[PDB]
Amino acid sequence: MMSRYEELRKELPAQPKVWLITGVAGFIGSNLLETLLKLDQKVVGLDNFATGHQRNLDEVRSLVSEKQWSNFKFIQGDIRNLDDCNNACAGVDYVLHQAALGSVPRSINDPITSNATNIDGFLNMLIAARDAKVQSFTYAASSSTYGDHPGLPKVEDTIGKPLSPYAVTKYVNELYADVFSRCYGFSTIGLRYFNVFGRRQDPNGAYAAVIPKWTSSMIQGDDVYINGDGETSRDFCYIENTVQANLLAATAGLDARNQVYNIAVGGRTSLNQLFFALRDGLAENGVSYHREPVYRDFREGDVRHSLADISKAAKLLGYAPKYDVSAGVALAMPWYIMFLK
Amino acid sequence: MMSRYEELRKELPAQPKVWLITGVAGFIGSNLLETLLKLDQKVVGLDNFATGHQRNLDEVRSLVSEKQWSNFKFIQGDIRNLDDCNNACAGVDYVLHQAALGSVPRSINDPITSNATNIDGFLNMLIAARDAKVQSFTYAASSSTYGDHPGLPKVEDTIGKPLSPYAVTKYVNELYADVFSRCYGFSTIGLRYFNVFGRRQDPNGAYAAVIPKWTSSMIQGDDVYINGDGETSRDFCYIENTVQANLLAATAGLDARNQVYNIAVGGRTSLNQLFFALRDGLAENGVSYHREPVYRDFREGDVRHSLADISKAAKLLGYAPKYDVSAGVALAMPWYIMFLK
């Protein structure tokens, strides 16, 4: 019949809970906010606007009812400040930890800054969440943890060596998560995301993800750069799939806890395919682009192939993504067109 | 004929180099200082006295010649401060990074503080050392990285799951070390120490290591507590063996770099044996103690058995420890007796 998520969507409004989203002003966080507020949940948000934007919070407000927006409490704070974490975790049922500094290149140029937020900040949240006695703690892990390991698809128990400072930080989140369960009995669920994309993923900045970067470049008629031969591949995961995984993990049974899960679709998309997918998607919306991609050197700290086996999440969480890359692109292009209008 | 270390001992005085010891006011650091100054080397030290002591620096000065002490430059600073790291690494050839907050129990009671120094501080040193273009970087890793893994003896490529926040931090030192080699070409050598002991290992404080704690307790006639059944075992490594490993790693060839090595003796000593070893050792020095040990609960985050396979260090570094536990105890007891006199 209906998937577990579909069933959860029906239950939540009937029995509202209090959720905390760190990094709520960012891409994934603001999308979680939109979903939760639309499900009539109470939400507390924490963000320092390091890479997030007030415009994202303004967009969510423009998308939800006036009543739903009143169920949102925002705290401008930093996860590196234990006091901000304590305040954000007060009276919270479920914590969805998304606050972090993404981008592999960024961590290569400045590992110290990425370390402070991604590791120190993560640890403070675990402590604050633990001390606040929350019901569940879900955090954003990363598929980059598979590192150099060549096999495909990727399975949770088999990982490789980290190729970047960023990859180390996300892996360390998993390490501390496991130790907090062993030493304090504080269970958590780590979600190893696989290149998430969709509305509100920042197209600006020197560290913009490939889809936002390429989409904006095409819309503007600028050259599009491919790092390497374009055969590099990813399991692009449309934001809706990731939102489902979070709500599912936040309400999962005991058996599914203290586990890390691949969150993706199980699809293989080379950068070369992506270029044409985005270009054809934009043309579909009346945006023409006739330039060929400009190939350059491979990017440092970059993983070659990334394809996820989502069986574990499917079995233990009842995870069932409904959005493939094309459908996600079809939904995303109009947003970027409007964003740069 | 003579081991590589013995040969190194002869070469160093003939061609003095500049060494940096972080955590120089502590147990291992102050012993490295004594050795290096006696080998007519130039030494820069960095310490914040968080757990270290000025008395340790005063003791070293009382043990080396006036000329040798003048080859020592001490900087009271914190590795969590990148500026202190930069200043300490200036014009240095070899870095021996010992600055950290040990103790598994301490990390359980306060993981945040241990994380800040052990991880953030470690990262700053890697950056500063890299930016200073040092010739070699050697750091103190930990045998606790083997965690829950049961097999014996322990081999470097096979580790288990961390049992404490402290164990995570030391493992993370290894993770960043490897990534700095891959991303910046900055080679390092990690030394997984196995319960080091000897003169100047602090007997005071709620987090004192077992040997200093027990020795002082016996000398004072207080009860001695064994956490568990006393069958828990360790590869106690007398400080001289660890000093050798550091100097060896600091001057090792290219092939031996970007490698982590077990540093111990390959001996198995149960806590029950240790109790009598220390008691008989003290009696040997005219200190009688007739109390039986008082057994209590196992300590949280504690590893059960720890025995090292030192073949890798022996083969690649030419590591050749000459001090077994008994010899180490015979050398250590007189120090503690004098310390509490």
Ligand SMILES: NC(=O)c1ccc[n+]([C@@H]2O[C@H](COP(=O)([O-])OP(=O)(O)OC[C@H]3O[C@@H](n4cnc5c(N)ncnc54)[C@H](O)[C@@H]3O)[C@@H](O)[C@H]2O)c1
């Ligand atoms: N985007 C992906 O494909 C992907 C994949 C794996 C993991 N992740 C993880 O998902 C999380 C969110 O990523 P995103 O794609 O929405 O990026 P994003 O930069 O748009 O969101 C990150 C948000 O966290 C905030 N933040 C950063 N440091 C903070 C701090 N120290 N205190 C408080 N707030 C802070 C930023 O302001 C930003 O709003 C990150 O943890 C990231 O590592 C993302």
Ligand SMILES: NC(=O)c1ccc[n+]([C@@H]2O[C@H](COP(=O)([O-])OP(=O)(O)OC[C@H]3O[C@@H](n4cnc5c(N)ncnc54)[C@H](O)[C@@H]3O)[C@@H](O)[C@H]2O)c1
């Ligand atoms: N003692 C062992 O058996 C053992 C085993 C494995 C690893 N180690 C490692 O060896 C190193 C030294 O341990 P030790 O036994 O000599 O303990 P110790 O506490 O006597 O020495 C640690 C020294 O580092 C200093 N320090 C701590 N944080 C600092 C900071 N943030 N900035 C500057 N200085 C700081 C302390 O003041 C202290 O002098 C540690 O890295 C420890 O993790 C020790």
Ligand SMILES: CC(=O)N[C@H]1[C@@H](OP(=O)(O)OP(=O)(O)OC[C@H]2O[C@@H](n3ccc(=O)[nH]c3=O)[C@H](O)[C@@H]2O)O[C@H](CO)[C@H](O)[C@@H]1O
């Ligand atoms: C498999 C993997 O490790 N992915 C992780 C990595 O994202 P990724 O670094 O894989 O995502 P990204 O969108 O920044 O890059 C995707 C691919 O597109 C390439 N590219 C990018 C921009 C451009 O102009 N041209 C171009 O070719 C880039 O080199 C990479 O090969 O880090 C992210 C955090 O930021 C997440 O943790 C992802 O899970």
Ligand SMILES: CC(=O)N[C@H]1[C@@H](OP(=O)(O)OP(=O)(O)OC[C@H]2O[C@@H](n3ccc(=O)[nH]c3=O)[C@H](O)[C@@H]2O)O[C@H](CO)[C@H](O)[C@@H]1O
């Ligand atoms: C194998 C392992 O993981 N060892 C690491 C761990 O040291 P250890 O925690 O193994 O060293 P420790 O001297 O603090 O304890 C040694 C053993 O003696 C026990 N004990 C201690 C005090 C007492 O009064 N009674 C008693 O029984 C204690 O429970 C432990 O089983 O952390 C150290 C840093 O501090 C180093 O990283 C060691 O490599």
